From a paper:
The HA structure has two distinct regions. The head region is composed of the receptor binding and vestigial esterase domains of HA1, whereas the stem region includes a long central helix of HA2. HA is a highly dynamic molecule capable of mediating a pH-dependent transition from a prefusion to postfusion state during virus entry. The prefusion conformation of HA is metastable, and the receptor binding head region acts as a clamp to keep the stem region in its metastable prefusion state at neutral pH.
In this study, solving the crystal structure of HA derived from A/Thailand/CU44/2006 (CU44) led to a surprising finding of a divalent cation Zn2+ bound to the head regions of two neighboring trimers. Surprisingly, the highest peak in the anomalous difference electron density maps was located at the head domain at the inter-trimer interface, which was tentatively identified as Zn2+, based on native gel electrophoresis and absorption-edge fluorescence scan results. In the crystal structure, the HA trimers line up in an alternating up and down orientation with head-to-head interactions, where Zn2+ is bound between two adjacent HA trimers. In the HA structure, the carboxylic oxygen atoms of Glu68 and imidazole nitrogen atoms of His137 are directly coordinated to the divalent cation, which results in a distorted octahedral, six-coordination geometry, involving bidentate interactions of carboxylic groups. The Zn–O and Zn–N bond lengths are from 2.0 to 2.2 Å. The amino acid residues, Glu68 and His137, coordinated to Zn2+ are highly conserved in a broad range of H1 subtypes, although they are substituted with Asp or Tyr, respectively, in the early 1918 pandemic and the seasonal 1933–1936 strains, and not conserved in other subtypes and type B. The divalent cation in the crystal structure appeared to enhance the stability of HA, but significantly decreased the melting temperature Tm of the CU44 HA, depending on the Zn2+ concentrations. The acid-induced conformational change of HA occurred even at neutral pH in the presence of Zn2+. When the purified HA crystallized at 10–20 mg/ml by mixing with an equal volume of precipitant solution, protein crystals were produced at less than 0.4 mM Zn2+, whereas precipitates were found at higher than 0.4 mM. Taken together, our results suggest that Zn2+ binding to HA has two phases: Zn+2 binds specifically to the head regions of HA at low concentrations, whereas, at high concentrations, it binds nonspecifically to HA, causing conformational changes similar to those induced by acidic pH.
Numbering used by the authors:
A (entry chain L), D (entry chain F), F (entry chain H): 1 to 165
B (entry chain K), C (entry chain E): 3 to 323
E (entry chain G): 3 to 322
The structure:
């Protein structure tokens, strides 16, 4: 949507992947599987948990507020009272609804950034070491095993390129 | 190696700024909609359940409100929307709504006989009741006030004083009777002048009977107007009268407290210990908002007219391997 | 192949968060600024145009309000800020401002003669007018009240009752008159003690006349205090007096409704229809905000003090290569 | 602005292009012109139409709101009335002005995202098929006719790259 | 060539969404918390500092409020929470809280003697005081009201009028006395019925004395109920009474103005010329929010309960 | 954070750099140092100054708001005044606190965009003239002196590529 990852050049998610929000789907000769990311997931969890906690924190608990019973020569004070009660309800409803609505697009795009930020740091690591297909995938000229695979999160590479050109 | 994102079976619909109906992996309801349905306790302490009585009747002692006279502590007060037991003997309730707002702060009572029926009024008959205030088949009267009448063809000048030594404000009530005929006035108080003085250091009022024919309510043509004043610690209240004084019998030493209130609700009582009570029911308050009722008691979620308030936490859901 | 974006010559200014005066391709005035300039109708129905009369005069029937007595249904009320007719006979209008608010709820009237002038008061002279309340050169009085005077040197004991069979609340109006001399009191009502009792099941008040000299207002040294009460279905109201009663002649059976109001405006009337009315003029509401007036009537956009409320829809505009 | 497309690496807009917010200006030997995009355009209108309507929805119409006209002994109650009426007008005036102000930067950046999202998806299609000049244009190694050019909307290319090195 | 961003030694913490304790290179206070601690002036004009008197005692002239009688202009009013000088002689102050609001609007006075002590009341004694209103060791009374008493065994019918030719609204105060005994009533005014009429063109009220025994407040068993009304330019006010009238002596031609108000404060007076004043102190207003006090006077920042209001201007700070 | 530059592929700021928010650290034979950028820096200062000023502007100065003193029989009106006074302070508190909280994230994301947008416009400048290490740095194969290095502000290059493939 706002960033090009979701529904853009990576048009989908993987039901197979659990244990995190982001990760990889390696298709190796030594087995395949959905190894879910760790650093970017828990970092996103920290942020959204703070988002939520930081949103309800800003909302005081409504302590006792009860009706007021005005008299027959008090229609005016009765209407003014209702004008206040309704006016504040109106303000808190709008403040509440307008916050989730606006903050929803921001939360979704936040994940968009996290994924697009993960698409890099790997395109940036595999500078000339892998083929970039426009579906969010990388074809290794390497036959990268389960040792260098966990070495895409970090890396002190057997860097020399072997020819496939 | 491919980079992608999580997905689940979640059917959680959510609204964004540029897109409606967005299904997502994780979210939070953020708004309380379900409630307990019953009038529960509040952090253990129970509410003053008024039953068929109105505040006017409870605090005046409408004989039909016999059972409420005991309770002197509470977290909140409940009134039926249409309580049929109040001012059984008609009259104006001077500042009724204010006395209600007065009692909304009270957390405890100390009902005591300011002017004991026996020994407060010798020389005046106090055995006076009305069928309007009938209780258990026989005519009765309010339990907290007391109807002074002539005794042996005389209503001698009256003077009773009370000194507030309770170190708390004393909610004193009293009333004035206005006969319909000149006959009842002379036959009842043996005079047509009839004054009524009620004096504090902060309250003074002289009452006079306006005699006239009025439409019969509770088959009564007369009326009794109900007055009252809180009496500060150290202050003294002086009652003087020539007739028509419905003397105070029981008073209340009020102890003020935090957030209590009067609510109207027809839900039944149960034994649940709710942290929040509303006219519709209790709420197990954890969410920041609520939509069952704007009236609330205890520590509760902010009331809003909203229906959804979802707030996604996860991301877009795109299944199908 | 090139990737770029649209552009036009639009001069639509917009204030963004990091830059003011930002020109953009498309936008929309989210705030209504123009108004109709006239007092229009409201979904077809016309408003009660009070003209030179104030609420005080229209409801009491200031003879100079000859023309307002017909209208008995309406969408809203218009009043001149300083209406020149109103009371005309000096005095206090007990609870004036509330009665204005009472009629602000009213959607229709049924003015009826609770006590018909002819045949209501035999043995009492009812032919009473004042130069202070003059209409068409002649002395007059209110169309809805009535000044009773002694007849044949006698003001016999008065007791007139009305029982509400209109199954609508009946606004009962009346007044008490205060002469400046003891002569006027004695010469007019044939007694100096003078009582005036008005008693319902929800209203009871005894009035007594205070004689004294007062500054001349409308060339009158006396005063007439104007009272009123709503009488609920089934209830009865009893007027008794020994003199000084300005008896009710016409009262009103109210039908309550939603959405009316009292507005002050100098804008003229037209036949335009409109969903929203303001003292400034009608508003053709499609936007959520407006800034012509905080007072508003009907379905209108919420009022704000803002001037722009622009809200771009498109993107930046960059013409000329 | 937030993204580099508008006023950034595409320093101007095209008065020539109508029929949409984004599009292309192809320079082929078989004629040139401003073929305006459709998919990203109607998709963007949907969202801005949603934002606007989802914003005015959160603003209930007023209704009759009338003055209260107090007497000479009700000065306190008059100020409280003036305090409520004014206090609410302010809360709504501020909110309304602050809403367009904040949400305008959001909409402008949204078009930026959309344009930058379209500058991609063509670099993702023309992997080795053209020279990328940073003015938002691509000079082709191919002689892409007016048949494959409209195949930039989707792309089912007679793909083999021709050398131009 | 490397592309990067700035950083400094700043310890400026900021709370953003999704991350607390976020240190940043630059920010701005956005919330005023410090205050002057003293009662300042307001764009030069000084406040009506009432001392031990309450507004009731100030406007009625509690003789112990001698010094407040001079000042006739002020920017705001300061009152002690529990001032012991006010209605020295017991009685009720009719619409007292409103008269506070009326005066809270007032910006200037013209105190003048509506009914001069000498010559206003011949045939009536005016030399009457109460130990309740004691000043400087001697019994006294209010400076602005006046106690009419019977003279030579007679309290003849009373009737006085006043014409507002002051081209400003004139606040007139008066009182009605209720003796505790019928004895005191007969010896003081020489009659037992006793009416008291007060009539303006839009104000009328007839007071009658209610004699009864009451608890002694300021060792007095009697009471004086205090009334007052505004008299518009042109209006005349008519006083009639048979006895028990606490007559007006000094009245006030009121001048209305813009935002003034009454505040409660124990802060001292200073010579500072502050633009905003609160019970806690003055505020050197430049920020949009503040949290020293909800009570405020003049052009001031909106009061809020907040503690922080950080608002970064720079970017994240990452040394090492 | 939202963009990948700050705390992402550029893991820190430079204490050495003063005189601006963004800039460069050239490693040349004619001396090295932290040359602070000018165009994007003042542009960010302009934007941040309007944010602040455009935000305090939306806050009209609180005029005299003082207590109201009710009598012994006006508790209802006494509470109503408190309900209005508090209900509004609650609204202004939330509006004030929630504004800095959300708009702080926007400001950081705003700076992130600017640095990442500065990382571009140089890749668009140094099309083939330098090896990009994903650390926000460029090692030139060129021997760009302090004359052409100061030409990264504009760029009129002794363009010929040197054989380094
Ligand atoms: C608020 O106001 C009303 C009236 O004050 C009151 O409730 C209604 O009226 C009575 C209370 O006066 C309710 O209960 C009654 O109980 C009596 C008999 O039951 C026993 O009660 C005690 C304890 O057990 C002992 O004295 C003894 O054990 C009694 O046997 C009796 O008064 C009622 O019994 C029937 O007969 C009366 C005539 O005497 C008749 O009028 C009733 O209608 C009733 O018929 C029953 O109707 C109900 C309706 O479904 C139901 O019980 C059943 O269908 C009928 N009986 C049987 C055996 O099948 C009566 O039981 C009465 O229930 C209340 N009515 C309603 C609709 O609630 C409230 O309690 C008051 N609240 C307060 C004061 O807080
Ligand atoms: C609200 O309040 C005002 C009163 O304060 C009232 O406005 C006036 O209403 C009266 C009617 O009661 C108007 O007064 C005069 O009525 C005469 C009748 O006119 C004829 O009309 C037809 C056909 O010929 C017939 O129905 C009728 O029988 C008559 O044949 C008319 O002759 C008057 O004309 C002018 O003559 C003199 C000159 O000194 C003057 O006294 C009048 O006031 C008026 O003078 C001024 O001249 C011009 C031209 O008219 C005008 O521009 C100017 O505004 C006039 N004066 C002022 C002060 O503005 C006249 O019609 C009178 O016009 C109404 N206006 C004013 C300002 O007095 C409203 O009707 C009340 N509204 C209600 C109750 O709804
Ligand atoms: C302007 O404002 C000034 C204040 O700056 C005010 O002056 C004060 O006036 C009050 C009286 O209203 C004075 O208080 C009195 O103090 C007297 C002496 O102090 C005694 O108590 C203390 C503490 O225990 C001891 O240290 C000391 O040795 C004394 O024992 C005291 O005599 C007064 O008490 C009673 O006396 C009179 C008549 O004799 C009578 O008013 C009462 O009997 C009174 O009160 C009694 O006690 C309680 C009060 O708590 C009361 O409820 C009870 O009903 C009373 N008892 C009876 C039997 O009725 C009184 O306490 C004070 O000293 C003055 N000065 C100062 C500096 O405070 C002026 O009066 C004001 N001027 C105006 C308004 O014109
Ligand atoms: C405590 O609370 C209880 C409620 O639990 C109160 O009791 C209830 O309220 C009434 C008073 O006791 C009782 O109402 C009755 O309704 C019956 C309807 O037919 C009938 O028994 C009476 O109502 C009318 O009936 C006749 C018509 O044929 C009349 O003769 C009769 O007098 C009544 O007439 C008129 O009613 C209208 C009402 O619209 C009035 O406008 C008129 O004024 C009435 N006529 C006259 C001449 O005045 C009877 O009223 C009801 O039974 C009773 N019991 C219950 C269980 O509800 C207690 O009173 C209360 N006690 C306190 C507060 O002390
Ligand atoms: C309905 O409204 C009309 C006005 O729209 C109202 O009629 C007006 O009433 C006043 C008072 O009667 C008039 O104003 C007068 O002006 C004339 C001359 O221009 C003066 O004679 C009056 O002066 C006073 O005279 C003495 C000196 O002060 C006083 O002893 C005396 O009490 C007078 O007040 C006064 O200044 C005005 O002319 C009329 N007419 C118009 C067209 O305004 C009418 O009374 C209202 N209806 C009812 C039933 O009252
Ligand atoms: C408010 O109320 C209180 C009491 O009701 C009152 O505080 C009093 O103020 C005055 C003046 O500040 C004090 O009266 C003084 O008492 C002492 C001696 O005991 C001295 O300050 C004074 O004596 C000397 O001072 C001067 C020479 O330099 C001369 O004025 C004098 O002749 C003496 O030489 C004077 O007697 C009183 O003590 C205090 N009481 C306290 C503080 O408890 C205050 O004035 C009231 N404010 C008002 C009415 O505005
Ligand atoms: C919302 O989405 C749910 C689940 O995708 C679907 O069942 C429903 O039809 C949608 N409602 C709309 C679009 O109003
Ligand atoms: C009446 O009571 C008073 C005191 O309360 C007493 O003086 C008098 O003797 C009593 N009369 C009797 C008991 O007859
Ligand atoms: C409240 O009731 C029980 C006891 O606290 C709890 O298990 C339940 O989840 C709560 N309901 C809510 C939070 O809706
Ligand atoms: C007064 O009214 C009575 C009512 O019966 C009637 O006789 C007559 O009209 C009047 N009395 C007279 C004229 O004596
Ligand atoms: C008329 O009424 C007055 C007071 O209402 C009363 O004094 C008088 O006796 C009555 N006349 C009768 C009943 O004939
Ligand atoms: C009320 O009764 C009278 C009979 O005197 C009748 O004329 C009137 O129509 C009745 N009211 C209604 C609403 O029918
Ligand atoms: C103004 O009024 C109606 C009602 O809102 C509106 O629909 C219409 O477009 C406008 N024009 C006319 C002539 O009514
Ligand atoms: C940061 O640096 C300057 C001196 O270089 C100093 O004045 C300032 O106080 C320092 N702040 C710190 C160390 O927090
Ligand atoms: C929060 O405060 C500072 C930085 O703001 C730092 O010590 C750390 O992040 C937190 N405090 C502690 C004691 O860790
Ligand atoms: C006061 O006294 C004399 C009578 O002794 C009287 O003539 C005079 O007019 C009176 N003055 C008034 C009432 O102002
Ligand atoms: Zn019983
Ligand atoms: Zn002195």
């Amino acid at each position: 949507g706002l960033f090009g990852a979701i529904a853009g050049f990576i048009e989908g998610g993987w039901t197979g992947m659990v244990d995190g929000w982001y990760g990889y789907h390696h298709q190796n000769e030594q087995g395949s599987g959905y190894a879910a990311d760790q650093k970017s997931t828990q970092n996103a969890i920290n942020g959204i948990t703070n988002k939520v906690n930081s949103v309800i924190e800003k909302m005081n608990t409504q302590f006792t507020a009860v009706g007021k019973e005005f008299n027959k020569l008090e229609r005016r004070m009765e209407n003014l009272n209702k004008k206040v009660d309704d006016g504040f309800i109106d303000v808190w409803t709008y403040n509440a609804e307008l916050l989730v609505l606006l903050e929803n697009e921001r939360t979704l795009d936040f994940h968009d950034s996290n994924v697009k930020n993960l698409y890099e740091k790997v395109k940036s690591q595999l500078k000339n070491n892998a083929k970039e297909i426009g579906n969010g995938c990388f074809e290794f000229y390497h036959k990268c095993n389960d040792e260098c695979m966990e070495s895409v999160k970090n890396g002190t590479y057997d860097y020399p390129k072997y020819s496939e050109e | 190696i491919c980079i992608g994102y999580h997905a689940n079976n979640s059917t959680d619909t959510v609204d964004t700024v540029l897109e409606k109906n967005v299904t997502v992996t994780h979210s939070v309801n953020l708004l309380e909609d379900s409630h307990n349905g019953k009038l529960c306790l509040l952090k253990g302490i129970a509410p003053l359940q008024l039953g068929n009585c109105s505040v006017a009747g409870w605090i005046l002692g409408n004989p039909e409100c016999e059972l409420l006279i005991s309770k002197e502590s509470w977290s909140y007060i409940v009134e039926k929307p249409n309580p049929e037991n109040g001012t059984c003997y008609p009259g104006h309730f001077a500042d009724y709504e204010e006395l209600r707002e007065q009692l909304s702060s009270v957390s405890s009572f100390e009902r005591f006989e300011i002017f004991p029926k026996e020994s407060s009024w010798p020389n005046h008959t106090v055995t006076g009741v009305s069928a309007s205030c009938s209780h258990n088949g026989k005519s009765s009267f309010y339990k907290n006030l007391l109807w002074l009448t002539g005794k042996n063809g005389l209503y001698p000048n009256l003077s009773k004083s009370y000194a507030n030594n309770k170190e708390k404000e004393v909610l004193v009530l009293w009333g004035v009777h206005h006969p319909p005929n000149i006959g009842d006035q002379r036959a009842l108080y043996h005079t047509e002048n009839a004054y009524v003085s009620v004096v504090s250091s902060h309250y003074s009022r002289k009452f006079t009977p306006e005699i006239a024919k009025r439409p019969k309510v509770r088959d009564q043509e007369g009326r009794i107007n109900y007055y009252w004043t809180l009496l500060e610690p150290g202050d003294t209240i002086i009652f003087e009268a020539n007739g028509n004084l419905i003397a105070p019998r029981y008073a209340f030493a009020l102890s003020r407290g935090f957030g209590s209130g009067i609510i109207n609700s027809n839900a039944p009582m149960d034994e649940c210990d709710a942290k929040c009570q509303t006219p519709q029911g209790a709420i197990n308050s954890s969410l920041p908002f609520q939509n069952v009722h704007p009236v609330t008691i205890g520590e509760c979620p902010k009331y809003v007219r909203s229906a959804k308030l979802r707030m996604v936490t996860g991301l877009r859901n795109i299944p199908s391997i």
